[PDB]
Design a protein around this ligand. Structure first.
Ligand SMILES: [Mg+2]
Ligand SMILES: [Mg+2]
Ligand SMILES: [Mg+2]
Ligand SMILES: [Mg+2]
Ligand SMILES: [Mg+2]
Ligand SMILES: [Mg+2]
Ligand SMILES: [Mg+2]
Ligand SMILES: [Mg+2]
Ligand SMILES: [Mg+2]
Ligand SMILES: [Mg+2]
Ligand SMILES: [Zn+2]
Ligand SMILES: [Zn+2]
Lengths: 77, 190, 49, 143, 169, 292, 55, 117
RNA sequence: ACAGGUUUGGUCCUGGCCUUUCUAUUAAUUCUUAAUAAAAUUACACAUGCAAGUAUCCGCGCCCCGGUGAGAAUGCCCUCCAGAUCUUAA
């Protein structure tokens, strides 16, 4: 690509982006599905964050980790 | 080759036993090279059209030797009876075009039980066989599945309200497109 | 309702532990509320508590 | 088809090192040692000659090393123990080839935890895979 | 090799066959032994043979020897918590010291097995990439899939030039 | 309480009936070779080496699990009408996880018609082979398992290799696995080649198939001709255990006959070539009594 | 990283102070920053053109 | 290398052969190249079907959900593949594309019916 | 290295060089098509085209990709991570 210190081209210096044609009956029914899908994926992301928290707590202060942490010191003594 | 149908007949014929005998076909063949060590790459192709490239290969010198996956006595001469490996081209003395075909014929014969090879003893894939898990068994269908409804109600095409249609058309003036209602259920063919 | 594959995964998870509960699992959307794009955002610096 | 044990002989100025080989490693030796073994009867052998390369000394040292061999039967007779061969392909099967004819000694041999063997760096390199020489893995003609 | 008294103890096999793996707490091993008397024969044989065996599999653990400082041979392990484990050896043989050390402070069979099983998980058979980390580079070589264009030529209907040419007309 | 192949009462008898033949168990294969090793051992050390070799050959003779035909997988998880013709081919999805067994992996398939179902066994095993290959498995079906190549491999008396290849290729609970196993079990007892499976790890499997097919005439006469009386009195006991309801099992109990007469009663009650079995038993008697 | 032969670059540190001072002293005021030409739809400060839907 | 920012993104690295695309599903940085340094490879995607007419797709769901809970973003083809698999709901882009395809088929049928008589 | 040639009236020993194998660039000679891989003199100076756009204004990215190896013996591997980015109440 270009750089921050490179000037733009002359063919696009005086160029503005143009939007395409918009179909309202399709755009609205697509935006509503967009929202219904984004809420679902947000809920799934929250579920995955909860699973990650559960696994991290099981790995930090788990009932399986404490047993080893105690039995190793016992055998050491 | 008069046979052209049974390559193994020549190996049992008399004109083979008096020429080669109990010795392999590459017994008296010696390949020339440049110094004390022959090259790691042998001749690519020894027969170009009708001309023979000087000293022919042990297989290519007598046209009655047909490379085929049926006559296993010929292919056995190129596989060590102890290690079961394939003899390489510098070891045999044949051209590469015939060595690749010999490797293919050996593999095809091993894939047909004609040529023996090592078969290791392999334990079963799974330690325990459990057909009760929900991976291979049937799962209780959803109430929306047994009813014939999509998994999500917003999967179907719903008609937006006329007020929302007008609100969109008021803001998207200039770029307005032809309207289109619900799409057909089944797509026809050509 | 959960997606089909994740629903099957959840139905197969607890089944191994001896849970015969055939109750339908649902995904909650309480914390899944999001603001539209027209909702203006804040411009101040966030406080790292 | 092979010799009994690995022979590392040192002639006047020719150092010969010959190792035992299975049925699949046929006469990968010097072009004169191969000529001698083809008339002797050895069909599988590996040999390396270092130092001098004189033909007469090479022949004399090869014959001396092949004559100073120790048969499994003679080893079993001198040790009063069974010479048990363990083929690597036959698994842990204790194959017996020579039996100690005579008085079978019931005294077990002293198991040395560290065998004081006289190894060679040329063999240590081959065991560790440090042989990066391009002339080592070259495909050559048959026997 | 050939030089030295025991050339066998300078081989990769000898250093790899020694199964002495300390725990994550041992940091320093100070071995103080003598050079006279029939008692320190075991300590001298241990220092001569088994020190490289332990040092090869414990590269992060310091191992320091001392000669003719105390009339009694001993070893001193300095743990991470500060506890000093003193092990006196006066008539112990070569293997007895190794077994005693493995019994007092070492990794169990299960401890080594779980670690060497967890290390196997990093190399996954399903991934793809170079031969250094993965078993397959390009999925073309799979027996069921489409072969590689450099090995098997693709038909004309699949070439991008034919699709770009049929769209021109 | 139906006796299964994994029951001890069947396994301990099958092991004794198979027997230990080290000269065939530890047989040099056709793989790479290396120079042998030599070491001096006493007689006690030789006996210890032989017993360790027996313990090792136990693992070689570990029996392969034989199961029944698994049920076909047919279950639809969802249906999407919008995907009626959006794709031409079907998408096969496989869950990769090293910490889970293969019997619990979700192998799903979205067909181009719009359905999302579970994959059949032939597709599940193929995908597991692709994403987790093991030595000895082919992704596609090998051509050697057809009738022509299989008949040729049987004529070349390679049934042990056929079994060791089929066990590695297919799952022991699939359909073609049982098909090929029964096909080779038909040929071995058609041609009288029971000796080829003497010391293999499939003798128990073929015996457990023969006791279910009630075809014991050929195996019994072949065991009698090899001077194997224990291997026949152990086979008749397996038959009696596997078929408790039967005249052969009831007459033996009501008579209290010994193991040597357990063969005669089985030859008289439910044997097809009973005259042949009786002639073979009499020929064994008139020879063994005179020679020993 | 951290070597014994590292040179104590001072110009790179002085340029930071120079540009920090020039950011605050020559800070463009919001008036001319948000000034707008209603004919060309071009910002005279930055040089960006406004979108077509906002015309 | 050192970046000024960026976010973890589970994308498809197109590493393959000419006229034979091959996408490796991988979680990597967002400012790194396509086939550059990555964090963890999860699955693979084969666009061209094999002899059985099947397009093989691989997903390591256990690590996928872990990374998504850790805060990794997804791309359009990754979301499309997840919707086709059933781990995520079907994408509205896929839905509207199916609707557009149905409308194109309907227009094709109408044109074929009007050009026949 | 399985090695071979080369000193001397001649032998042995010591000994250097070369040949034998494999890869890459240029030059000569010759030359028919496809596919795949790769296009490698220049940190010497550049004519010309394009490579950073998006958006109801705000803002966001603008050596990120891509390019090269002049300097640095620079470095490989290992602890700690300020700070920056994504989602959260953390
Ligand atoms: Mg520039
Ligand atoms: Mg010389
Ligand atoms: Mg490419
Ligand atoms: Mg001189
Ligand atoms: Mg050129
Ligand atoms: Mg030129
Ligand atoms: Mg902008
Ligand atoms: Mg670069
Ligand atoms: Mg310098
Ligand atoms: Mg940090
Ligand atoms: Zn040829
Ligand atoms: Zn490829």
């Amino acid at each position: 690509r270009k750089t921050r210190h490179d000037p733009p081209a002359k063919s696009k210096a005086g160029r503005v982006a143009t939007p395409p044609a918009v179909d309202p009956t399709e755009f609205f029914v697509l935006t509503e599905r967009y929202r219904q899908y984004r809420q679902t994926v947000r809920a799934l992301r929250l579920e995955f964050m909860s699973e990650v928290r559960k696994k991290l707590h099981e790995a930090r202060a788990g009932v399986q980790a404490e047993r080893k942490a105690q039995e190793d010191a016992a055998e050491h003594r | 080759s008069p046979y052209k149908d049974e390559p193994w007949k020549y190996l049992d014929s008399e004109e083979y036993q008096n020429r080669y005998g109990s010795r392999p076909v590459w017994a008296d063949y010696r390949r020339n090279h440049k110094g004390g060590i022959p090259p790691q790459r042998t001749r690519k192709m020894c027969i170009r059209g009708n001309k023979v490239a000087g000293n022919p290969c042990p297989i290519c010198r007598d046209q009655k030797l047909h490379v085929d996956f049926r006559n296993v006595k010929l292919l056995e001469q190129f596989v060590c009876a102890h290690t079961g490996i394939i003899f390489h081209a510098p070891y045999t003395g044949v051209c590469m075009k015939q060595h690749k075909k010999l490797t293919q014929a050996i593999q095809k014969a091993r894939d047909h039980g004609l040529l023996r090879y090592h078969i290791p003893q392999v334990e079963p894939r799974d330690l325990d066989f459990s057909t009760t898990h929900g991976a291979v068994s049937s799962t209780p269908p959803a109430p929306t599945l047994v009813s014939g409804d999509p998994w999500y109600p917003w999967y179907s095409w719903k008609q937006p309200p006329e007020r929302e249609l007008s609100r969109l058309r008021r803001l998207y003036q200039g770029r307005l497109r032809e309207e289109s209602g619900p799409p057909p259920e089944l797509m026809p063919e050509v | 309702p959960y997606p089909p594959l994740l629903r099957a995964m959840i139905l197969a998870q607890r089944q191994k532990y001896g849970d015969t509960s055939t109750e339908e699992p649902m995904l909650n959307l309480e914390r899944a509320r999001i603001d539209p794009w027209d909702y203006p955002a804040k411009l101040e610096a966030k406080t790292k508590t | 088809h092979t010799i009994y044990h690995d022979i590392s002989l040192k002639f006047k100025r020719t150092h010969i090192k010959m190792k035992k080989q299975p049925r699949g490693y046929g006469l990968h030796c010097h072009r004169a040692i191969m000529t001698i073994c083809r008339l002797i009867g050895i069909k599988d052998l590996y040999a390396k000659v270092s130092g001098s390369v004189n033909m007469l000394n090479l022949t004399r040292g090869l014959f001396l090393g092949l004559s100073r061999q120790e048969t499994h039967q003679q080893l079993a007779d001198k040790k009063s123990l069974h010479v048990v061969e363990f083929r690597e392909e036959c698994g842990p099967l204790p194959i017996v080839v020579a039996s100690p004819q005579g008085a079978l000694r019931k005294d077990p041999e002293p198991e040395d935890e560290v065998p004081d063997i006289t190894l060679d760096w040329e063999d240590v390199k081959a065991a560790q895979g440090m042989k990066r020489s391009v002339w080592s893995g070259l495909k050559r003609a048959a026997t | 090799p050939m030089k030295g008294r025991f050339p066998i103890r300078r081989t990769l096999q000898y250093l790899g066959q020694g199964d002495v793996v300390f725990k994550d707490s041992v940091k320093v091993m100070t071995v103080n032994y003598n050079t006279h008397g029939e008692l320190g024969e075991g300590a001298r044989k241990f220092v001569f043979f088994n020190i490289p065996q332990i040092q090869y599999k414990n590269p992060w653990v310091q191992i320091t020897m001392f000669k003719n400082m105390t009339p009694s041979p001993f070893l001193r392990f300095y743990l991470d918590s500060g506890e000093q484990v003193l092990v006196d050896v006066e008539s112990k043989s070569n293997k007895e010291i190794v077994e005693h050390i493995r019994k007092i402070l070492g990794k169990n069979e299960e401890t080594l097995e779980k670690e060497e099983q967890e290390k196997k998980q990093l190399s996954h058979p399903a991934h793809f990439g170079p031969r250094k980390y993965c078993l397959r580079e390009c999925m073309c070589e799979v027996e069921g899939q489409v072969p590689c264009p450099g090995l098997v030529p693709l038909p004309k209907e699949m070439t991008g030039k034919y699709k770009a040419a049929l769209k021109a007309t | 309480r139906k006796p299964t192949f994994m029951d001890e009462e069947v396994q301990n008898i099958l092991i004794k009936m198979t027997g230990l033949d080290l000269q065939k168990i530890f047989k040099p294969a056709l793989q790479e070779l290396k120079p042998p090793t030599y070491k001096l051992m006493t007689q006690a050390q030789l006996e210890e080496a032989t017993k360790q070799a027996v313990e090792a050959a136990k693992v070689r003779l570990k029996m392969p699990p034989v199961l029944e035909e698994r049920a076909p997988i047919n279950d639809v998880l969802a249906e999407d009408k919008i995907l009626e013709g959006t794709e031409t081919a079907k998408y096969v999805f496989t869950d990769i996880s090293y910490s889970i067994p293969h019997r619990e992996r979700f192998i799903v398939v979205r067909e181009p018609s719009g359905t999302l179902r579970k994959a059949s066994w032939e597709e599940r095993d193929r995908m597991i082979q692709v994403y987790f290959p093991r030595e000895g498995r082919r992704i596609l079906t090998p051509v050697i398992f057809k009738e022509e190549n299989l008949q040729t491999m049987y004529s070349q008396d390679q049934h042990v290799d056929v079994l060791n290849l089929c066990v590695a290729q297919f799952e022991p609970d699939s359909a073609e696995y049982i098909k090929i196993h029964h096909h080779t079990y038909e040929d071995i007892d058609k041609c009288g080649k029971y000796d080829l499976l003497r010391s293999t790890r499939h003798f128990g499997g073929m015996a457990w198939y023969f006791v279910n097919k009630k075809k014991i005439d050929g195996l019994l006469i072949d065991q009698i001709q090899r001077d194997l009386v224990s291997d026949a009195t152990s086979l008749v006991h397996l038959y009696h255990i596997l078929h408790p309801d039967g005249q052969s099992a009831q007459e033996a109990k009501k008579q209290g006959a010994e193991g040597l007469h357990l063969i005669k009663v089985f030859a008289k009650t439910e044997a097809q070539k009973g005259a042949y079995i009786e002639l073979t038993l009499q020929a064994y008697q008139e020879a063994f009594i005179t020679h020993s | 990283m951290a070597r014994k032969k590292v040179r104590p670059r001072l110009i790179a540190e002085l340029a930071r102070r120079v540009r920090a001072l020039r950011e605050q002293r020559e800070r463009p005021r919001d008036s001319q920053r948000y000034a707008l030409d209603y004919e060309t739809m071009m910002r005279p400060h930055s040089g960006n053109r406004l979108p077509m839907r906002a015309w | 290398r050192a970046y000024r920012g960026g976010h973890l993104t589970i994308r498809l690295a197109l590493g393959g052969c000419t006229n034979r695309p091959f996408y490796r599903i991988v979680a990597a940085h967002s400012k790194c190249p396509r086939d550059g340094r990555f964090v963890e490879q999860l699955g693979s995607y084969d666009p061209l079907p094999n002899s059985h007419g099947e397009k093989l797709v691989a997903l390591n769901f256990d690590r996928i959900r872990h990374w998504i809970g850790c805060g990794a973003h997804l791309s359009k083809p990754v979301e499309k593949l997840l919707g086709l698999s059933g781990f995520y709901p079907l994408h509205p882009m896929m839905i509207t594309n199916a609707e557009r395809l149905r409308r194109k088929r309907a227009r094709e049928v109408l044109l074929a019916s009007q050009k026949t008589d």
